[PDB]
């Protein structure tokens, strides 16, 4: 079936891709199996690892770790399965939403080319959206001085194998996906969102607000806590943060799940 359309990551070929000259990233790994790829960079940099600019593949998951302590689900050689780790002290606290926002964004554009049909761009806070379906989703994790990045990518991951609301670049109409191409593409924009990220550059927002499925749409805000929020979404602050109109009143939320409406 899909098996034939999933050989595996080429490790050696990543590494010269993405290690040296001109290049930000130090370190690439490509494991065959982990629990999940942000616990594994946090645990390095738990007992003293410098973590900055170092890259973790996996090509399965068998313990991934969603939002608010939910899970991520994965196949072996479905999915491009990465974290990275982000020195961020030298930034102020209340900027590094904007990072988790920027990843998206980048996961977005490497495989925007491929991709054209309705709802295809960023859902608040991090979900790159497909036709409806969810095709990433990210997670970010805090060990300072580090953040750790993770992505979960679906390449040729079926949704019935993962969660009925997903989606992949192959049910999208990609019909011979290269995971080895899109990790380095990806890999590639992630360092320039990053680096504007810590610049503070106009055009990371600018270019976030350009993909947004969010912004101008009714949507239903679940709050942590299980409260929900229903009004506009229209526009982010400069902390990441989403910005609500509730009947001409502005609710700005942290943190939650979106859900597009009518
Ligand atoms: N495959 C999948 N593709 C679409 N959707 C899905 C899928 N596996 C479940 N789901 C559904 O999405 C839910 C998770 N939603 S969420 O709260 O916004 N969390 C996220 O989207 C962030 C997930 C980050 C995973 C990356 S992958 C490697 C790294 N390590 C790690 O443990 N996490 C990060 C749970 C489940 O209902």
Do not use: M
Not at 53 to 58: K, M, S, Y
Not at 68 to 93: C, E, K, N, Y
Not at 176 to 202: F, K, T
Not at 241 to 255: H, K
């Amino acid at each position: 079936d899909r098996d034939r359309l999933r050989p595996p990551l080429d490790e050696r070929s990543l590494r010269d891709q993405l290690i040296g000259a001109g290049s930000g990233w130090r370190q690439l790994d490509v494991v065959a199996q982990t629990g999940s790829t942000n616990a594994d960079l946090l645990a390095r940099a738990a007992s003293g690892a410098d973590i900055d600019g170092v890259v973790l593949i996996a090509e399965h998951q068998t313990a991934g770790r969603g939002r608010h302590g939910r899970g991520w689900a994965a196949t072996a050689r479905a999915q491009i399965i990465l974290s990275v780790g982000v020195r961020v002290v030298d930034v102020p606290v209340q900027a590094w939403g904007w990072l988790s926002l920027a990843a998206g964004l980048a996961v977005l554009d490497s495989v925007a080319p491929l991709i054209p049909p309705a709802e295809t761009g960023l859902k608040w806070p991090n979900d790159v959206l497909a036709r409806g379906g969810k095709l990433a989703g990210i997670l970010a994790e805090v060990a300072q001085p580090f953040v750790v990045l993770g992505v979960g990518l679906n390449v040729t991951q079926a949704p019935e194998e993962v969660d009925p609301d997903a989606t992949s670049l192959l049910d999208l109409g990609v019909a011979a996906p290269d995971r080895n191409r899109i990790a380095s593409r990806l890999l590639r924009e992630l360092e320039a969102r990053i680096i504007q990220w810590r610049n503070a550059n106009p055009q990371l927002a600018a270019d976030y607000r350009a993909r947004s499925l969010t912004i101008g749409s009714r949507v239903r805000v679940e709050l942590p806590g299980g409260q929900d929020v229903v009004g506009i979404a229209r526009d982010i602050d400069d902390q990441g943060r989403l910005c609500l109109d509730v009947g001409g009143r502005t609710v700005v939320v942290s943190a939650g799940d979106v859900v597009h409406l009518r």
